[PDB]
Amino acid sequence: MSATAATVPPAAPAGEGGPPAPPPNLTSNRRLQQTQAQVDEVVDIMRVNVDKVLERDQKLSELDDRADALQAGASQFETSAAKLKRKYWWKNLKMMIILGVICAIILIIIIVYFST
Template sequence: MTITYSCIANGQVILAELALTGGSYQDAVSSVLKLVLLKPEKKTTARIGSYVYHTLLADGITYLCATDNLMDVTLPSAFLDEVSRTCSENPLMFQESFPPSNAIVADFQQVLGRCMMKYNQNQGEFMISDLKSQVTDVRNSMSQNVGKMLKREEKLNILIDRTDNLQVATKAFQKTTTKASKKMWWKNYKIIIIISSIFIIIIIILLSTNVISV
């Protein structure tokens, strides 16, 4: 990926611009700047023709660059962040009226040229850094997911233990209830036998004494 064009604009007024390749960027840049004015978001991306235009809106100033790769947004974003940070550190940035003096325009162009050269030459390092960042994010996400799984497993184990304890308590209660029921049944059975025996004895006595006759 190559940053082929960059500029700094106040509204639709271009304060400084620099192109590394031939071709006309003015119509596309004008369209993108209009889009930024209509929808003032911090960062926007638009594909026009064979180039992708990235913008950064900071303190009312639009920083823009064009690249020849649709997929890569990390390097252009880093480029625009550095350009905006460097320009905002210029003490004359917010003191002069716009359009700025030739000295400020020259400073802006130097910043653009320096950053374009830096990011175009070191894009491999930025890709590696981005990959490392993505790997770190994936690893952190996996660690969080593993932690959540372990917490779920711990809660599940606690629930299983409670279920097992409840089942044991239920079985113990059932055994106790069964024993109590059998004991009560035998007790009632003995009482019935005793009462029946006493009743039979009384009947025999009454019959033997002719108190009752058959």
């Protein structure tokens, strides 16, 4: 025969596992502890602790941002939005780029002056 081969069918590993994987049935045991699901839950707790100190128990608990009821003006509300927008933008890089230019001039002058 010119060329004969069995050409077995696809191996078809079959897998792609990824079930819901809900919380552990028991708080503590042994096998579960060895798993990463244990430390995974600690991540949420640790995150809260970080923001726990920052957060404070307000006596008013009114959750009201303001109660003075000024009237009208720029208000801190408008300024607050500026912070959020700043995150999207990056004017810090511009400050470094321009800053380097100024410093570059000084370096050139010093180098030239030294070598006169």
